[PDB]
Amino acid sequence: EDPPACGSIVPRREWRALASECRERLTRPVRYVVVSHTAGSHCDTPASCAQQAQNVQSYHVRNLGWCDVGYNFLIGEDGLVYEGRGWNIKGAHAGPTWNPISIGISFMGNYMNRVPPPRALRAAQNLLACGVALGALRSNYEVKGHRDVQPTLSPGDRLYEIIQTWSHYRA
Amino acid sequence: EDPPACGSIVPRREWRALASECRERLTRPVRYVVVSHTAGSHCDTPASCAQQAQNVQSYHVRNLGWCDVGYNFLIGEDGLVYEGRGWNIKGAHAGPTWNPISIGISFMGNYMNRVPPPRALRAAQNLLACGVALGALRSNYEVKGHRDVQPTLSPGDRLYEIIQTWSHYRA
Amino acid sequence: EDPPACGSIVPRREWRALASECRERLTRPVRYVVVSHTAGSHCDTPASCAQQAQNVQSYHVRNLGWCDVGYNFLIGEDGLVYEGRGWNIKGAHAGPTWNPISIGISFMGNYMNRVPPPRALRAAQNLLACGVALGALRSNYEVKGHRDVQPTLSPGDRLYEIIQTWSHYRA
Amino acid sequence: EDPPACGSIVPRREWRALASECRERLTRPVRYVVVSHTAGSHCDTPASCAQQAQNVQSYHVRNLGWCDVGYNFLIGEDGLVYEGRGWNIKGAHAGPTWNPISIGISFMGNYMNRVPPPRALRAAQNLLACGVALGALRSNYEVKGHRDVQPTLSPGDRLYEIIQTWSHYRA
Numbered sequence: 001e002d003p004p005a006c007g008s009i010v011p012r013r014e015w016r017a018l019a020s021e022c023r024e025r026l027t028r029p030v031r032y033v034v035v036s037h038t039a040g041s042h043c044d045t046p047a048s049c050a051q052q053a054q055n056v057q058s059y060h061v062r063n064l065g066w067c068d069v070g071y072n073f074l075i076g077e078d079g080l081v082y083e084g085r086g087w088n089i090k091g092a093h094a095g096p097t098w099n100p101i102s103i104g105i106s107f108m109g110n111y112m113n114r115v116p117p118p119r120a121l122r123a124a125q126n127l128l129a130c131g132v133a134l135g136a137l138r139s140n141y142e143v144k145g146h147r148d149v150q151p152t153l154s155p156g157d158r159l160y161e162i163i164q165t166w167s168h169y170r171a
Numbered sequence: 172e173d174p175p176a177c178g179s180i181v182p183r184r185e186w187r188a189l190a191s192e193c194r195e196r197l198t199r200p201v202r203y204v205v206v207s208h209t210a211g212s213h214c215d216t217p218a219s220c221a222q223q224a225q226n227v228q229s230y231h232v233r234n235l236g237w238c239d240v241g242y243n244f245l246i247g248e249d250g251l252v253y254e255g256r257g258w259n260i261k262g263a264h265a266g267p268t269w270n271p272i273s274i275g276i277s278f279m280g281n282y283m284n285r286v287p288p289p290r291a292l293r294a295a296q297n298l299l300a301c302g303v304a305l306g307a308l309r310s311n312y313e314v315k316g317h318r319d320v321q322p323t324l325s326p327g328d329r330l331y332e333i334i335q336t337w338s339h340y341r342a
Numbered sequence: 343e344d345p346p347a348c349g350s351i352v353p354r355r356e357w358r359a360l361a362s363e364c365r366e367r368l369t370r371p372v373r374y375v376v377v378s379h380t381a382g383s384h385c386d387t388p389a390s391c392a393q394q395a396q397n398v399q400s401y402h403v404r405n406l407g408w409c410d411v412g413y414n415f416l417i418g419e420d421g422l423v424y425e426g427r428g429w430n431i432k433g434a435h436a437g438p439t440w441n442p443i444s445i446g447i448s449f450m451g452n453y454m455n456r457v458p459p460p461r462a463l464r465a466a467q468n469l470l471a472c473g474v475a476l477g478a479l480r481s482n483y484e485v486k487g488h489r490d491v492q493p494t495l496s497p498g499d500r501l502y503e504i505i506q507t508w509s510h511y512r513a
Numbered sequence: 514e515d516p517p518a519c520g521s522i523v524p525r526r527e528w529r530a531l532a533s534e535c536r537e538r539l540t541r542p543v544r545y546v547v548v549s550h551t552a553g554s555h556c557d558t559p560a561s562c563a564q565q566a567q568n569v570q571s572y573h574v575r576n577l578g579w580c581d582v583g584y585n586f587l588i589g590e591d592g593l594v595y596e597g598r599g600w601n602i603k604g605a606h607a608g609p610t611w612n613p614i615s616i617g618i619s620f621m622g623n624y625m626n627r628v629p630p631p632r633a634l635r636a637a638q639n640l641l642a643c644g645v646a647l648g649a650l651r652s653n654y655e656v657k658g659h660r661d662v663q664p665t666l667s668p669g670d671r672l673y674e675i676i677q678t679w680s681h682y683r684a
């Protein structure tokens with residue numbers, strides 16, 4: 001009944017992110033979403049999770065010399081979504097084939113034998129619904145596991161098993 | 172002109188590799204070597220490492236839909252090197268920035284909570300010495316860990332810790 | 343496999359193609375697409391382009407002694423795609439390394455100092471999309487310029503610069 | 514802004530269309546396709562059919578006072594499809610019952626005593642297949658002749674009998 005009806009996200013400033021230097025854009029509406037895990041520690045409070053995002057970005061920018069954290073969005077077990085390169089800027093999370101044509105969302109943690117809490121699964125599912133609402137994603141977008149498109153255990157066996165049941169999943 | 176028999180490497184046919192569709196070439200002498208782990212099951216026999224190489228290649232070719240196993244060589248816990256894309260063909264193991272300028276060797280197993288056995292480490296060292304002797308690698312080649320150039324746990328904490336001690340490692 | 347109509351192709355009979363003697367099949371799905379230019383006259387009407395397709399085939403078959411026009415498909419500045427050897431027959435357009443592993447599409451014209459009009463570019467890219475849906479081409483096919491696989495001006499400097507921007511382009 | 518939209522459709526700007534003022538959106542997936550003829554001049558080259566498209570729209574907009582050319586798409590005997598109101602905007606081509614629930618495509622010419630060439634018929638099928646692939650048309654869309662839904666000779670006797678033979682046609 002009025003337009004902007006979709007998910008809250010922790011803004012970069014809020015998680016105290018280094019300025020992005022990335023400028024290559026995606027073309028909306030984007031067709032694919034690749035779900036990964038950071039494979040590191042998880043966080044379960046808004047406090048722990050903002051720090052984690054700064055840590056993930058630090059690894060990609062400081063160590064890897066990347067223009068910004070590689071993921072478009074990050075999911076906290078705080079139940080919050082952390083803004084990464086966002087809906088419009090090409091990410092660096094799934095290789096040269098998938099990066100220019102997808103949105104990379106990464107769950108912050110390691111989900112090989114642990115599942116993300118429901119507030120995390122809700123957070124991610126709402127963000128995607130929001131992306132469709134916004135025209136950032138196609139209504140018939142496809143979700144892929146990181147391991148479906150790159151050689152990796154990402155997004156973790158437990159999380160991978162869950163995304164496979166999602167409405168938009170397509171291997 | 173030195174063409175000696177330094178390659179105690181298991182030929183693709185011997186491990187029953189599917190034919191490669193890859194054709195892009197590396198330019199020798201190659202300056203970099205990127206060390207990864209398959210993060211999967213290890214093998215400590217020629218029979219089982221031949222099968223493991225097929226399984227890793229199967230993942231890359233049948234699932235990821237790639238032209239070949241992404242690694243230039245694989246290292247088995249049987250102490251044997253398995254021919255992947257080899258010295259002359261660009262691998263798909265460390266991203267587009269590092270793939271054209273490196274040889275990617277991957278240890279078949281997960282080394283976050285394990286070190287490769289001494290025979291696998293000798294296998295890898297002997298292979299790089301072979302690469303220098305053939306002129307495939309620069310005599311002062313630089314070794315990187317997979318996690319130094321891409322976001323990943325690869326090649327595993329224990330293996331990462333070992334390679335950082337190598338004469339050829341360059342931070 | 344899947345029966346869906348896709349694209350619009352000028353069938354061989356319609357451009358009055360001599361019958362094909364070619365028998366060697368390509369193995370589905372094909373990974374590569376090589377784009378060339380005929381370096382011949384261009385044409386901008388269905389009538390003139392049907393004639394051009396017949397002329398190119400005449401050259402290849404009568405003068406070069408080949409079993410058919412060398413390209414799998416030809417693209418006219420009329421914005422139409424002309425059926426060449428088609429999706430299933432190995433062509434003669436990129437040398438012995440690349441012929442057996444690719445589909446060759448050629449823009450009828452010389453694009454060193456001219457570009458094909460948008461309608462020719464659309465037809466080409468739509469044809470490739472159709473190839474994917476038919477299972478003729480890999481979903482992750484890679485498009486190369488003829489000059490990427492043989493020393494040649496083809497597909498002409500102007501055309502090459504354009505295909506470099508295509509989604510599936512990989513030098 | 515990535516690969517071009519399916520169907521090899523000549524964009525409005527390419528045929529120098531007057532800007533549209535139409536706003537009413539269709540509800541996808543649209544169930545019906547209504548085939549009409551313009552009953553105007555035909556054309557058989559990109560140059561002349563772009564001009565014909567412009568002529569048809571000029572009449573609809575300048576003379577009839579409509580927000581845009583009434584058809585969703587136009588088909589030329591050059592074998593190309595001309596973008597009219599497109600996939601998402603409600604047309605003005607089949608009356609108040611049919612406009613809201615269909616995509617109207619119109620063959621540019623008078624098909625009372627003449628058939629459209631094969632390339633023009635292929636273009637139409639290319640277009641409809643494309644609409645299904647986009648989600649603009651339902652997979653099992655139904656094709657109607659203009660005279661099936663309004664008192665008219667459109668789409669012309671000769672074209673009407675062809676349409677009745679299409680697998681998606683429904684009397």
Ligand SMILES: OC[C@H]1O[C@H](O[C@H]2[C@H](O)[C@@H](O)[C@@H](O)O[C@@H]2CO)[C@H](O)[C@@H](O)[C@@H]1O
Binds near residue numbers: 093265266321322
């Ligand atoms: O090539 C553009 C972009 O490439 C790199 O980001 C890569 C990354 O190195 C790889 O890991 C790979 O998986 O794909 C990413 C993008 O496709 C560079 O790091 C970056 O500096 C450069 O702009």
Ligand SMILES: CC(=O)N[C@@H]1[C@@H](O)[C@H](O)[C@@H](CO)O[C@H]1O
Binds near residue numbers: 268
């Ligand atoms: C040099 C380079 O980046 N190569 C890529 C790899 O990252 C990519 O994801 C995959 C899919 O084609 O295989 C290689 O071609």
